[PDB]
Amino acid sequence: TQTVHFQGNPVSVAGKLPQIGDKAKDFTLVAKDLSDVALSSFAGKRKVLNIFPSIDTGVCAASVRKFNQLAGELENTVVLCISSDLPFAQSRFCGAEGLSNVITLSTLRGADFKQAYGVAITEGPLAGLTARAVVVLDGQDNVIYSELVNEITTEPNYDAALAALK
Amino acid sequence: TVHFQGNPVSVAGKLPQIGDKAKDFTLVAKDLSDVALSSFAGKRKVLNIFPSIDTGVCAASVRKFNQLAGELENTVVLCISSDLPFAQSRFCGAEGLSNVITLSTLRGADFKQAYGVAITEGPLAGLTARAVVVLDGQDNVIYSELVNEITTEPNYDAALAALK
């Protein structure tokens, strides 16, 4: 069981984030239209899994939208912005707003994903939400990049996530 | 069994009837803190339960009812949805109201079972059903309605009348 920080304060995160060389578990999550979307749906493609505590925000950092868009226009690649936000709140997100081959997914259903990818925050004011993380998967579900950011409010290594794509 | 345009939808458990005791719950406020039912000791509680309050335009009758119940003496209106405290702030029917507080399902899925509002079928599975439950000062149910159509308004007039 890992441990991260929100603004300095310790946050317990249940499970274990898939290491490089692991086979990532299949999941099913909720799309914007309330339709269900499985990881099996993208067989062969590369999957950038960008995990957020919340994407429900008016203000967006340029690097977030820059990372998502860049990885999105790479050949045979898809970006998945996942949070515990409801699909009604996920559609006001700048990092995925109008970004081609970048879709949002809610944990409204299939919330067991959180435990399976070691991103389930289980203590304090952020309980029921996900920990900030990026996980990059190859054509056949193998983890080629993974990072659990020690401080939640800070950003993951975007250059490195891109450099594995490659 | 409720209905969402169109066709039947299952709801786990069932709504507490008049005469029963409420059964304590804990949900999440807008500041992300924990708020328990027992924290409103002595007050009457209107539990206005929604599938989602995250919208930029509401029917205003929803705002009217919460305002009227909020105005009444020794009363607290608790608007409950599955929306996160980030999305509940937008709501056009609880905005800047006096005694109307929004509460989130985030880490209180235990409330959804104890009060029988958990939708388990269709595109709405994991969301909450439309229902109004009114409690007195001693947390006794004095009015309960589970609307069998999600796009349909509950009997506000009857809910208000039970407080009189």
Numbering used by the authors:
A (entry chain B): 2 to 167
B (entry chain A): 4 to 167
Provide the authors' own sentences about this structure as they appear in the paper.
Tpx constitutes part of the bacterial defence system against reactive oxygen species (ROS) and, correspondingly, is upregulated when E. coli is exposed to oxidative stress. Atypical 2-Cys peroxiredoxins are functionally monomeric, in contrast to the typical peroxiredoxins, i.e. the resolving (Cr) and the peroxidasic (Cp) cysteines (C61 and C95, respectively in the case of Tpx) are situated on the same subunit. Tpx contains three cysteine residues, two of which (C61and C95) form the redox active disulphide bond. ypTpx has a regular thioredoxin-like fold: a seven-stranded β-sheet, with β2 and β6 running anti-parallel to the rest, although with an inserted N-terminal β-hairpin (βN1-βN2) absent from other peroxierdoxins.
The redox active site of Tpx is made up by CP and CR (C61 and C95 in ypTpx, respectively). There is a conformational change between the two states, involving the partial unfolding of helices α1 and α2, and a shift of 8.4 Å for C61 and 5.1 Å for C95, respectively, as presented in Figure 4. Rigid body modelling of the oxidised Tpx crystal structure against the SAXS data, using BUNCH, based on a single chain, and imposing P2 symmetry yielded a model similar to that for the dimeric crystal structure. The binding pocket is mostly hydrophobic with one hydrogen bond proposed between the ME0052 p-hydroxyl to the ypTpx I153 carbonyl, which fits with the chemical shift change for the neighbouring T154 amide. The chemical shift data indicated significant shifts in the amides of residues from both subunits, highlighting the importance of the dimer interface for the generation of the binding pocket and compound binding, as illustrated in Figure S2A.
